[PDB]
C-alpha cells in the first residue's frame, strides 16, 4: 500500500506483447551527445544484463495545475492523479521534456521526447491520470 | 562516476567513427556511397560540443 | 460541424472557452477527422 | 490560386454568362475572405518591383471586377475599397497602366466614372512631388514624359467634358477636386512633343 | 466544414500579442493539425468554368 | 528502485572500489592500450 | 477543501480580491463551517 512520493529514484516501465510474448521495456536516454530517448528491454536479464545506469529518473517536484500555472506566470509530498510532475535524468541531470521535433512519419501528429538542460517552460511538466476505473 | 560514464560513451562513439572512416579508406566512392554504414556526424558533433 | 461552429463563433468573434473545450474534445477523439488528417490513415488533404 | 480565379470571374463577367449560378458563386467567394484579405495586406505591397509584371495584371482584373455587372452594391463597394487601399501603397511608376485604362471612361463622366477620378485625385495629391517638382518624388525617380502627356490629356478631357455637359451638383463637386489635383500636380511649364 | 470549424476556433489576435500561454498552445495545436502546404495546394486547384 | 535505500550501507546500482585489507591496493583492470586488451584484473594499487 | 485551495491559487496573484471573489469565499467558508459543526457533532460524545 506504499504510495509514490517526491524526491526519489523511479524507473518508467512499459509492457508490450509481440508474437504472444510479453516484453517489459523501460525508457532510457543518454543525455550527452544524444537527447532522444529509447526503450531498452529489461526482460531476458539472465542471458544478457541490461544497461540500467541511464534508466533512473527522479521526481524533482510535484505541483497542482493552478499552482503550476501561477509558477510559470511568475518534504516528500505524496503524488496523486491530476498533478503535474517534473522528471530529471539521474546521470545527465537534464529534465525530461517533449521536444518540438517530429521525426516520425507514420503519425504526422507525433512529437519526440528527450532531455533538456533547463527546467524553464511547460514542456518538461507531465500530468498523471488514472488508467483504470478503480 | 559521471566522468567514467561519459568516457565510456565517448570512447564507444569515437571508436565507431574511426572504424567508419577506415571502412572506405583507399577506395574512391565513385557513383554510389561506400557500403559501410553512414557516419554518425551529428552525434560526433554534439558530443564534441 | 455546423452546430459546433455556431456554438463556437458568435457576433464575428470566437469564444475562447468554447473553442478550447471543442478543440480538446476533437484532439481527444482523432476519429472525428475521418480518413484524412489521421495518424493511422495519413491520406492528406490534397489526396482526399 | 488567387489571381487565376479573379481572371476567370472577369471572363465570366460577360452578359451571356452573367446570370450563371457559378458566376454568382464566384462573385460571392471573391467578395468575402479574399478581397478583404488583399485590403488588409495592402501596406505589405510596398516595394513590389520584382513582381511588377504580375502586379499590373492583378490591378487590371480588379478594375474589371469593379466595373462589372450583376454585382450587388456591397460587393461593388468592397471592390472599390480594395482598389483604393491597394493604390494607396503602390509606387506611382507602377500605376501608369491604371490611368491609361481609366482615361477610357473617366473623361466621359458616366455613372461608373465617379469612382475612377476619385482614385485619381487621391493619387495625385499623394504623388504631387512626382510631377510638379523637377526632382522626383521621395525614393522615386523623375516622372516619364508619357505620364505627363497622359495626365495633360486627362485634364483637358475632364475640363471640356465638364464644359459641354449639363450641371449636376454631385458630379460637379465630386469632379472639381480631381481637376484641382491634376492642375496642381502637372508643372505649369510642361511642353508636349 | 471541418476546416472552417478549426479556423473559427483560432484565438484572437489581441490574445496572441498578449502572450497568453493558452492562446499560443491552441495556435500551435492548430498549426500541427494541418500544414500550410496543403492549404496553398488545395487553393491552387482550379474549378469547372 | 531506491525507495528502501538506507544510508551507510551498500546498495545496488552503485559505483565503488574494492580495496584490500591493507587499503594500499584495489581491484583494477589493466592499463589503457594493453597487450591483454583489458581482460584480466589485478591488485595494482597506488596512483590507480 | 480542494476547491478552496484552487480558488486561493487563482486569486493569489491578484493584489486585491474583488467583490465576487469575496462573496464566493464567504459562501464556501459558511458551508465548510456547517460541515465542521456536523463533524464535531458526530464525535462530541465519547463515541469510540
DSSP G22-38: HHHHHHHHHHHHHHHHH
Please give the grid coordinates belonging to residue D140: 522615386
Number of alpha carbons in the 13 Å side-chain half-sphere of residue F33: 1
- Cβ distance B43 to A33 less than 8 Å, yes or no, reads yes
Residue to mutate among E20, E22, E25, E32, with most A CBs inside 10 A, is: E32
Nearest CA in chain A to F15: A53
Nearest CA in chain G to A66: G9
User: Which positions in chain F touch A2 (Cβ < 8 Å)?
Assistant: 3
Q: Which residues contact D17 (CB under 8 A, 6 or more apart)?
A: D23
- Cβ distance G9 to A73 less than 8 Å, yes or no, reads no
Burial G12-30 (b: 16+ CB within 10 A, else e): eeeeeeeeeeeebeeeeee
Specify the DSSP class assigned to residue D111.
G
Interface of A with F in 53-82 (CB under 8 A): 53, 56
Burial B5-40 (b: 16+ CB within 10 A, else e): bbeebeeebeeebeebeeeeeeeeeeeeeeeeeebb
User: Which positions in chain E touch A122 (Cβ < 8 Å)?
Assistant: 21
Burial F7-36 (b: 16+ CB within 10 A, else e): eeeeeeeeeeeeeeeeeebbeeeeeeeeee
Q: Which residues contact C20 (CB under 8 A, 6 or more apart)?
A: E22, E26
Q: Which residues contact B23 (CB under 8 A, 6 or more apart)?
A: B34, B35, B36
CB atoms within 10 A of CB A94: 19
Q: Which residues contact A87 (CB under 8 A, 6 or more apart)?
A: A57, A58, A59, A60, A95, A96, A124, A126
How many Å apart are CA A66 and CA A72, to the nearest integer? 10
Nearest CA in chain C to A108: C39
Q: Pairing mode, if any, of strands A57-63 and A95-99?
A: unpaired
The experimental method is cryo-EM
Nearest CA in chain F to A2: F3
- Cβ distance A72 to E21 less than 8 Å, yes or no, reads yes
Distance of CA A68 to the CA centre of its chain: 18
- Cβ distance F1 to A2 less than 8 Å, yes or no, reads no
Interface of E with C in 8-47 (CB under 8 A): 8-12, 15, 22-23, 26, 29-30, 33-34, 38-39, 41-42, 45
Chains contacting E (3 or more CB pairs within 8 Å): A, C, D
Q: Is F8 on the interface with A (CB under 8 A)?
A: no
With beta carbons less than 8 A apart as the criterion, state whether A9 and A18 touch. no
Q: Is B15 on the interface with A (CB under 8 A)?
A: no
User: Which positions in chain E touch D8 (Cβ < 8 Å)?
Assistant: 47, 49
Q: Which residues of G are annotated as a binding site for Ca(2+)?
A: 41
With beta carbons less than 8 A apart as the criterion, state whether A70 and A103 touch. no
Q: At what angle do helices B41-48 and B2-23 cross, to 10 degrees?
A: 140
With beta carbons less than 8 A apart as the criterion, state whether A92 and A30 touch. yes
How many residue pairs bridge chain A and chain F with CB atoms within 8 Å of each other?
A: 13
- Cβ distance A110 to C42 less than 8 Å, yes or no, reads no
Nearest CA in chain E to D7: E49
Nearest CA in chain E to C8: E9
DSSP string, chain D: --HHHHHHHHHHTSTTSTT-HHHHHHHHHHHTTTHHHHHHTGGGGTT-GGGHHHHHHHHHHHHHHHH-SS--HHHHHHHHHHHHHHHHSS-GGGTHHHHHHHTTTGGGT-GGGHHHHHHHHHHHHHTHHHHSSSSPSTTS-PPPHHHHHHHHHHHHHHHHHHHSS---HHHHHHHHHHHHHHHHHS-TT----
Q: Flag whether F touches D (3+ CB pairs, 8 A cutoff).
A: no
Q: Is B25 on the interface with A (CB under 8 A)?
A: no
How many Å apart are CA D12 and CA E26, to the nearest integer? 41
Alpha-carbon distances, residue G22 vs A38, G4, G11, G19 (angstroms): 51, 12, 11, 5
Chains contacting F (3 or more CB pairs within 8 Å): A
Distance of CA C46 to the CA centre of its chain: 18
Chains contacting C (3 or more CB pairs within 8 Å): A, E
Amino acid at each position: 500500500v506504499q504510495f509514490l512520493r517526491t524526491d526519489d529514484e523511479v524507473v518508467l516501465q512499459c509492457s508490450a506483447t509481440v508474437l504472444k510474448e510479453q516484453l517489459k521495456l523501460c525508457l532510457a536516454a543518454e543525455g550527452f551527445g544524444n537527447r532522444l530517448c529509447f526503450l531498452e528491454p529489461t526482460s531476458n536479464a539472465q542471458n544478457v544484463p541490461p544497461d540500467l545506469a541511464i534508466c533512473c529518473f527522479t521526481l524533482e517536484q510535484s505541483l497542482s495545475v493552478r499552482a503550476l500555472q501561477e509558477m510559470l506566470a511568475n518534504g516528500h509530498r505524496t503524488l496523486l492523479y491530476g498533478h503535474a510532475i517534473l522528471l530529471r535524468h539521474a546521470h545527465s541531470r537534464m529534465y525530461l521534456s517533449c521536444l518540438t521535433t517530429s521525426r516520425s512519419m507514420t503519425d504526422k501528429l507525433a512529437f519526440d521526447v528527450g532531455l533538456q538542460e533547463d527546467a524553464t517552460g511547460e514542456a518538461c511538466w507531465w500530468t498523471m491520470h488514472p488508467a483504470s476505473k478503480q | 562516476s559521471q566522468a567514467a560514464r561519459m568516457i565510456h560513451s565517448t570512447a564507444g562513439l569515437y571508436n565507431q567513427f574511426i572504424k567508419g572512416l577506415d571502412s572506405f579508406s583507399g577506395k574512391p566512392r565513385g557513383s554510389g556511397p561506400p557500403a559501410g554504414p553512414a557516419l554518425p556526424i551529428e552525434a560526433v558533433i554534439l558530443s564534441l560540443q | 460541424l455546423d452546430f459546433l461552429r455556431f456554438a463556437v463563433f458568435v457576433n464575428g468573434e470566437s469564444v475562447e472557452e468554447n473553442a478550447n473545450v471543442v478543440v480538446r474534445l476533437l484532439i481527444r477523439k482523432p476519429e472525428c477527422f475521418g480518413p484524412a488528417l489521421r495518424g493511422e490513415g495519413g491520406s492528406g488533404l490534397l489526396a482526399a | 490560386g488567387f489571381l487565376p480565379d479573379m481572371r476567370a470571374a472577369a471572363s465570366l463577367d460577360t452578359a451571356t454568362f452573367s446570370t450563371t449560378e457559378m458566376a454568382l458563386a464566384l462573385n460571392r467567394y471573391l467578395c468575402l475572405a479574399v478581397l478583404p484579405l488583399i485590403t488588409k495586406c495592402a501596406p505589405l505591397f510596398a516595394g513590389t518591383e520584382h513582381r511588377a509584371i504580375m502586379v499590373d495584371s492583378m490591378l487590371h482584373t480588379v478594375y474589371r471586377l469593379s466595373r462589372g455587372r450583376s454585382l450587388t452594391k456591397a460587393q461593388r463597394d468592397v471592390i472599390e475599397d480594395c482598389l483604393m487601399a491597394l493604390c494607396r501603397y503602390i509606387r506611382p511608376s507602377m500605376l501608369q497602366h491604371l490611368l491609361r485604362r481609366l482615361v477610357f471612361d473617366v473623361p466621359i463622366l458616366n455613372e461608373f466614372a465617379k469612382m475612377p477620378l476619385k482614385l485619381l485625385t487621391n493619387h495625385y495629391e499623394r504623388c504631387w512631388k512626382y510631377y510638379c517638382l523637377p526632382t522626383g518624388w521621395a525614393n522615386f525617380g523623375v516622372t516619364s514624359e508619357e505620364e505627363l502627356h497622359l495626365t495633360r490629356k486627362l485634364f483637358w478631357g475632364i475640363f471640356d467634358s465638364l464644359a459641354h455637359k449639363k450641371y449636376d451638383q454631385e458630379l460637379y463637386r465630386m469632379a472639381m477636386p480631381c481637376l484641382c489635383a491634376i492642375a496642381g500636380a502637372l508643372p505649369p511649364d510642361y511642353v508636349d512633343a | 466544414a471541418l476546416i472552417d470549424l478549426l479556423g473559427r476556433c483560432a484565438p484572437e489576435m489581441h490574445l496572441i500579442q498578449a502572450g497568453k500561454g493558452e492562446a499560443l498552445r491552441i495556435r500551435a495545436i492548430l498549426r500541427s493539425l494541418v500544414p500550410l502546404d496543403d492549404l496553398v495546394g488545395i487553393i491552387s486547384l482550379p474549378l469547372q468554368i | 528502485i531506491c525507495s528502501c535505500c538506507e544510508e551507510g550501507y551498500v546498495t545496488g546500482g552503485h559505483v565503488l572500489r574494492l580495496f584490500h585489507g591493507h587499503m594500499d591496493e584495489c581491484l583494477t583492470i589493466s592499463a589503457a592500450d594493453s597487450d591483454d586488451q583489458r581482460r584480466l584484473v589485478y591488485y595494482e594499487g597506488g596512483a590507480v | 477543501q480542494e476547491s478552496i485551495s484552487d480558488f486561493y491559487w487563482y486569486y493569489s496573484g491578484k493584489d486585491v480580491i474583488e467583490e465576487q471573489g469575496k462573496r464566493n469565499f464567504s459562501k464556501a467558508m459558511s458551508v465548510a463551517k456547517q460541515v465542521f459543526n456536523s463533524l464535531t457533532e458526530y464525535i462530541q460524545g465519547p463515541c469510540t
